[PDB]
Amino acid sequence: TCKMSQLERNIETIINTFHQYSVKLGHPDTLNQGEFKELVRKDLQNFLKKENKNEKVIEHIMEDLDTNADKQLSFEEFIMLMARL
Amino acid sequence: CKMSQLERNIETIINTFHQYSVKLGHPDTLNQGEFKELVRKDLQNFLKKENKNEKVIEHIMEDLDTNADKQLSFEEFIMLMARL
Ligand SMILES: [Ca+2]
Ligand SMILES: [Ca+2]
Ligand SMILES: [Ca+2]
Ligand SMILES: [Ca+2]
């Protein structure tokens, strides 16, 4: 709504962007390695410019974020990336 | 720099957190007072009904304070997005 603060609008956008990529393949609510690499390469071109230059590094970031090591990133796991920057 | 919409969002969540966390005590964390102010001013819609009861807002924080030190680190705070 118009009443939505900037924090609220930005939270909604992060949620939508996560699901925009997580719905693509496999389970709709999580990012497998390919979905994560695509989000990182297309939408974190700047915040992860260095890392993006070594696929193995991105894979390593995913393993760090994948708390329960089920090879999938849930929303709660993925957002921790924000705190790692 | 052509920051993506995602990077802008993240910048905004980091700036807002820090806008409130620098106000009292430790600059890097939100205490109960800073958290209440952040919710009162910037989560008026997402937490409209809860904002009517500051005891509810205090419970929300206890819930987010994983290591129970009465301070919310950025990592603890952002989990709120998951509770929506
Ligand atoms: Ca998926
Ligand atoms: Ca996982
Ligand atoms: Ca503080
Ligand atoms: Ca804490």
Rg (CA), chain B: 13
B73 is in an annotated binding site: no
CATH 3.40.980.10 fits A1-85, yes or no: no
H helix or E strand, kind and range, residue A80: helix A80-84
Quoted resolution (Å): 2.1
Half-sphere exposure of B80 (CA within 13 A, CB side): 24
Give the right CATH number for B1-84 from 3.30.360.10, 1.10.260.30, 1.10.238.10, 3.40.50.300.
1.10.238.10
B66 C-alpha to ligand 2 centroid (Å)? 19
Q: How far apart are CA A59 and CA A47, in angstroms?
A: 16
Ligand nearest to the CA of A35: 1
A19 is in an annotated binding site: yes
A60 is in an annotated binding site: no
Alpha-carbon torsion angle B64, B66, B71, B74, nearest 10: -70
Substitution target from B1, B6, B14, B73 for chain A, most A beta carbons within 10 A: B6
Amino acid occupying residue A2? C
The SS3 assignment for A1 reads: coil
CA triple A70-A29-B67, angle to 5 deg? 65
Q: How far apart are CA B34 and CA B24, in angstroms?
A: 7
Q: Which technique was the structure solved with, according to the deposited record?
A: X-ray
Tell me the domain boundaries of chain B. 1-84
Residues with CB under 5 A from ligand 1 (ion): A 22, 26
Question: Which residues of B fall within a CB distance of 8 Å from A2?
Answer: none
